[PDB]
Amino acid sequence: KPKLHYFNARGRMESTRWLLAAAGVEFEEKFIKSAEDLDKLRNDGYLMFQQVPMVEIDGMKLVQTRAALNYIASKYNLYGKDIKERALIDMYIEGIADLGEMILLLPVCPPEEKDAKLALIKEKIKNRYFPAFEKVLKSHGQDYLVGNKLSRADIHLVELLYYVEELDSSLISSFPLLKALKTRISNLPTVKKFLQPGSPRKPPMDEKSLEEARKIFRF
């Protein structure tokens, strides 16, 4: 089983949980609880840049979110059929990571900047990101973003649509193709299982979880 090293929170590990579960791959997590837990990994030389996420997979200790995502994606045939398809995939999911990063760090945003940061995020969802991905689906009329077959791009976009719904459920309302994609992807047997109660899917970060973050990661 791949083994995911992170704390018990979404943070930078959640896109990897979604991808493994989507690919039908059982994984184990080793939850970090304290700074001491983190220091153990560093001391044991598990972490190339002293940071998590780290995924143990196939005798590698893969730190850096994208390094394990790319490797999981190629291994399980979710990175398209050739390097041109991979280029479209990487362009789509990097815009996804961009929006994703804004939402991810919103909890950590200095309190006097939170209002403006939220407003910006909602503005970009509506005017920049959602229109870009609706354009894609409209262009080809197909069920999947790339190559008319399931890829990473679909899973990462659907994960983002959940986080967008938690922010403001109206934001997707003018984007019918994005809504239909969320439904279709959420009904694929693996994703459906991941979305059910009691899965390893993680909740939004609350105040307690955030305080655990500051103690583990020393910030």
Binding site for a second copy (CB under 8 A): 48-50, 58, 60, 62-68, 70-71, 74-75, 83-84, 86-88, 90-92, 94-95, 98, 128-129, 132
105 binds, among ligand GTX, a second copy, none (CB under 5 to 8 A by kind): ligand GTX
Dump the DSSP string for 125-164: IIIIIHHHHHHHHHHH--SSSSTTS--HHHHHHHHHHHHH
Per partner kind, with CB cut-offs from 5 to 8 A, the member of a second copy, ligand GTX, none near residue 192 is none
Phi, psi dihedral angles at 60 (to 5 degrees): -105, 150
Name the site residues for ligand GTX (rule: CB under 6 A): 11-12, 50-53, 64-65, 94, 98, 105, 107-108, 205, 213, 217
What is the residue type of 14? E
Question: Residue 120 or residue 180: which is nearer to ligand GTX going by CB?
Answer: 120
Three-class SS of residue 6?
A: strand
Q: Choosing among a second copy, ligand GTX, none, which partner's interface includes residue 8 (Cβ < 5 to 8 Å by kind)?
A: none
**Annotation-wise, does 42 bind a ligand?**
yes
In the bound complex, what is the minimum distance in angstroms from residue 14's beta carbon to ligand GTX? Answer: 10
Return the residues preceding each gap in the chain, C–N over 2.5 A, or none.
none
Minimum CB distance to ligand GTX smaller for 51 or for 190: 51
Give Cα 12 distance to the centre of its chain: 7
Nearest approach in angstroms of CB 192 to a second copy is 28
CA separation for the pair 30, 55 (Å, rounded): 10
Side-chain-side CA neighbours of 74 within 13 Å: the count stands at: 9
Q: Please tell me whether 51 is known to bind a ligand.
A: yes
Q: Which residues line the annotated binding site for glutathione? A: 6, 42, 51-52, 64-65
